[PDB]
Amino acid sequence: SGFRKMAFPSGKVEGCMVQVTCGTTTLNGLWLDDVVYCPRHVICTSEDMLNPNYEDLLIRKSNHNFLVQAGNVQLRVIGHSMQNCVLKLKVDTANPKTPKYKFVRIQPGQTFSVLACYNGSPSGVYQCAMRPNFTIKGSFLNGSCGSVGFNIDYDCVSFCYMHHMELPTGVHAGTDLEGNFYGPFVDRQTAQAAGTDTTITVNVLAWLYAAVINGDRWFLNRFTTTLNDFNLVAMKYNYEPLTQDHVDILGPLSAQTGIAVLDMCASLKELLQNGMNGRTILGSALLEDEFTPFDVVRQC
Amino acid sequence: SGFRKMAFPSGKVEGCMVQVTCGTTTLNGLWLDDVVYCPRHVICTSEDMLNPNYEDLLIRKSNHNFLVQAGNVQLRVIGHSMQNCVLKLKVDTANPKTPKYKFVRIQPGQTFSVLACYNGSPSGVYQCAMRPNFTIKGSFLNGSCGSVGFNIDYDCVSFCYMHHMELPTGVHAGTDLEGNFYGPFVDRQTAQAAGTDTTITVNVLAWLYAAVINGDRWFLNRFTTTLNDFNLVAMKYNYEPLTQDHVDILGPLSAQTGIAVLDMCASLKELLQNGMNGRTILGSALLEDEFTPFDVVRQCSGVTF
Numbered sequence: 290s291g292f293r294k295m296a297f298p299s300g301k302v303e304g305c306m307v308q309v310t311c312g313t314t315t316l317n318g319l320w321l322d323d324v325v326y327c328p329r330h331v332i333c334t335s336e337d338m339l340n341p342n343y344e345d346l347l348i349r350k351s352n353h354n355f356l357v358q359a360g361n362v363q364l365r366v367i368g369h370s371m372q373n374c375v376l377k378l379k380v381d382t383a384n385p386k387t388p389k390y391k392f393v394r395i396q397p398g399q400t401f402s403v404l405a406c407y408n409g410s411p412s413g414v415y416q417c418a419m420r421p422n423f424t425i426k427g428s429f430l431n432g433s434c435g436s437v438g439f440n441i442d443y444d445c446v447s448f449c450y451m452h453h454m455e456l457p458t459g460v461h462a463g464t465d466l467e468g469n470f471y472g473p474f475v476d477r478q479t480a481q482a483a484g485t486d487t488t489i490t491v492n493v494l495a496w497l498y499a500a501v502i503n504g505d506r507w508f509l510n511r512f513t514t515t516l517n518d519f520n521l522v523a524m525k526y527n528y529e530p531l532t533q534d535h536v537d538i539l540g541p542l543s544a545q546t547g548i549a550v551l552d553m554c555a556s557l558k559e560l561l562q563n564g565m566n567g568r569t570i571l572g573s574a575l576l577e578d579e580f581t582p583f584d585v586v587r588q589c
Numbered sequence: 590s591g592f593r594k595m596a597f598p599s600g601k602v603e604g605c606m607v608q609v610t611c612g613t614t615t616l617n618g619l620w621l622d623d624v625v626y627c628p629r630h631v632i633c634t635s636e637d638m639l640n641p642n643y644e645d646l647l648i649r650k651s652n653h654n655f656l657v658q659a660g661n662v663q664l665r666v667i668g669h670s671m672q673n674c675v676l677k678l679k680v681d682t683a684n685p686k687t688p689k690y691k692f693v694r695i696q697p698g699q700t701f702s703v704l705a706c707y708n709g710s711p712s713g714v715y716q717c718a719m720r721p722n723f724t725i726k727g728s729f730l731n732g733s734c735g736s737v738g739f740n741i742d743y744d745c746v747s748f749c750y751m752h753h754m755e756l757p758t759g760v761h762a763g764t765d766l767e768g769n770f771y772g773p774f775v776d777r778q779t780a781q782a783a784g785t786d787t788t789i790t791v792n793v794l795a796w797l798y799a800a801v802i803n804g805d806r807w808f809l810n811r812f813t814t815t816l817n818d819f820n821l822v823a824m825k826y827n828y829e830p831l832t833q834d835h836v837d838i839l840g841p842l843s844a845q846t847g848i849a850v851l852d853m854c855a856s857l858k859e860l861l862q863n864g865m866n867g868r869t870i871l872g873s874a875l876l877e878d879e880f881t882p883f884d885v886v887r888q889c890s891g892v893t894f
């Protein structure tokens with residue numbers, strides 16, 4: 290019993306974290322085999338960030354301008370190339386601790402663990418979700434760039450995020466491990482603001498099924514709803530539209546508890562209208578949206 | 590910016606997790622040097638749990654009854670002994686991945702990371718606190734026994750908890766790594782219940798300082814209070830008494846934000862007496878008590894391991 294925001298064990302990722310330094314800038318890199326992956330903004334000064342010409346800044350760099358440190362060992366850079374917003378540093382030593390891995394691009398609503406690092410050293414691990422506005426509500430201080438997000442279903446690490454920037458509202462933006470940003474963000478100091486955020490409906494529903502599995506049913510009601518009527522109401526509370534894909538995805542949790550997806554949608558509609566009236570659901574006074582249907586099945 | 594419930598990186602502990610099987614019961618063990626530590630209830634059958642005489646059950650066991658598995662390698666048990674509610678299995682192979690470590694007993698209100706394991710394999714890591722009633726609000730299924738709690742200070746792992754059981758309210762109980770239970774619990778299947786819990790006051794104050802550091806100040810006011818008046822109000826809402834030690838411990842956060850501890854106490858007094866009025870603090874509608882003052886400092890400074 291119990292339900293906690295749980296992160297994947299971080300050991301497989303800790304053994305990949307390195308420190309990357311270019312001039313005055315220091316950030317984190319991910320060492321897999323003989324390549325160190327890091328944000329390309331490591332080659333920039335603060336002034337360069339207004340309108341950086343990364344191709345022009347990179348062509349002026351030589352291999353020995355990049356200082357890579359793995360623990361107390363200096364790695365030697367023997368090549369470099371840029372792929373989108375990530376820099377790939379070819380090093381002369383393959384990481385003996387390289388786990389079984391894949392690079393995966395995730396969709397909004399999907400969750401992952403973040404191993405926050407400073408100076409190539411891991412400080413903490415936490416769980417978070419890719420918000421519908423493509424930002425993450427992380428916990429990152431200056432020097433955390435290059436920290437990665439991942440999942441470890443089985444023995445394979447699926448890297449899905451690399452940290453690049455903090456937006457003016459305190460939320461975070463980054464790329465997949467191929468250097469493509471999530472969202473309309475650019476690795477440039479320009480006016481960019483996170484779009485209006487919304488609640489991940491399919492995840493709130495999954496967490497309501499987690500509460501039913503753990504023995505709480507106070508929020509259920511005798512009503513049902515059509516998918517269209519549910520979406521008309523949910524949009525009024527800044528909730529993401531629920532699609533037929535989301536209904537199909539909730540199938541196993543619906544069968545396990547015996548509560549139809551549209552019947553759980555009716556409880557959600559009522560919770561939005563009434564609030565919790567001094568009650569909690571799985572130790573929370575808010576409707577939680579950072580657990581996916583898959584996360585609920587894995588933990589319960 | 591940002592404030593998350595953060596756990597220590599778990600790698601140093603992952604390399605110590607093993608599977609221990611004795612008869613029909615399978616649970617997790619902690620392999621440090623040539624010893625595997627695990628709950629002594631691994632020697633109990635379902636019926637033995639009703640009223641076990643652990644010395645009598647153990648004397649009938651041979652080293653070959655304990656099946657220890659580290660990944661895909663079988664470890665050979667060459668000796669065994671009991672220390673309180675923990676079984677110590679002497680194995681013939683020292684763990685090459687043994688980190689620098691200490692066994693420490695924590696106090697209620699202290700936090701730690703739990704590496705939840707099943708069949709000797711780590712599944713997840715989460716942060717929690719030792720409640721004032723000595724239980725933990727963990728997330729554990731059948732097979733999680735032997736999972737451990739820990740803190741890291743520099744390169745040293747301080748093991749503070751080993752999971753043994755779940756109480757009827759869904760909360761959890763366990764021991765330190767010397768086998769002494771936290772709380773008035775026993776490793777038997779008898780009527781046991783979690784006592785009435787209280788809120789960790791010093792931790793709520795630390796989390797209010799974390800909110801101020803993160804730009805949330807709506808709850809601040811011009812007022813102050815005495816420690817005595819604050820404690821009279823704290824005892825009314827099932828909050829733990831705040832001591833002069835807690836006030837001293839909050840000193841660095843009181844200096845970083847420019848808000849005196851008794852001024853933050855006056856803010857908490859008003860939140861207790863009047864609620865949040867539809868507002869949130871660090872994305873929460875409840876007053877959070879599972880971040881210690883040290884956790885707030887560490888997360889708002891970027892301390893690494």
Ligand SMILES: CN(C)CCOc1ccc2cncc(N3CC[C@]4(CN(S(=O)(=O)CC5(C#N)CC5)Cc5ccc(Cl)cc54)C3=O)c2c1
Pocket residue numbers: 330338429430431432433434453454455456457458461475476477478479590
């Ligand atoms: C007090 N400040 C001057 C220090 C910045 O503090 C911080 C604090 C936390 C950070 C967390 N992640 C990523 C950071 N970074 C590092 C690189 C940088 C820098 N900036 S910024 O300082 O304007 C960002 C900010 C705002 N709004 C002040 C939070 C512009 C920028 C543009 C694009 C890209 Cl790809 C990178 C960057 C950035 O965001 C952090 C930066």
Ligand SMILES: CN(C)CCOc1ccc2cncc(N3CC[C@]4(CN(S(=O)(=O)CC5(C#N)CC5)Cc5ccc(Cl)cc54)C3=O)c2c1
Pocket residue numbers: 290630638729730731732733734753754755756757775776777778779
């Ligand atoms: C279908 N379920 C009821 C089966 C097990 O459920 C579970 C489910 C989750 C568990 C999480 N942690 C620790 C468990 N464990 C494992 C060992 C056991 C078992 N119990 S019990 O059968 O009473 C089951 C329980 C109760 N109360 C929890 C519901 C007797 C017992 C006596 C002493 C000691 Cl030291 C240990 C134990 C225990 O608590 C979990 C047990």
Ligand SMILES: [Cl-]
Pocket residue numbers: 394395396399
């Ligand atoms: Cl996805």
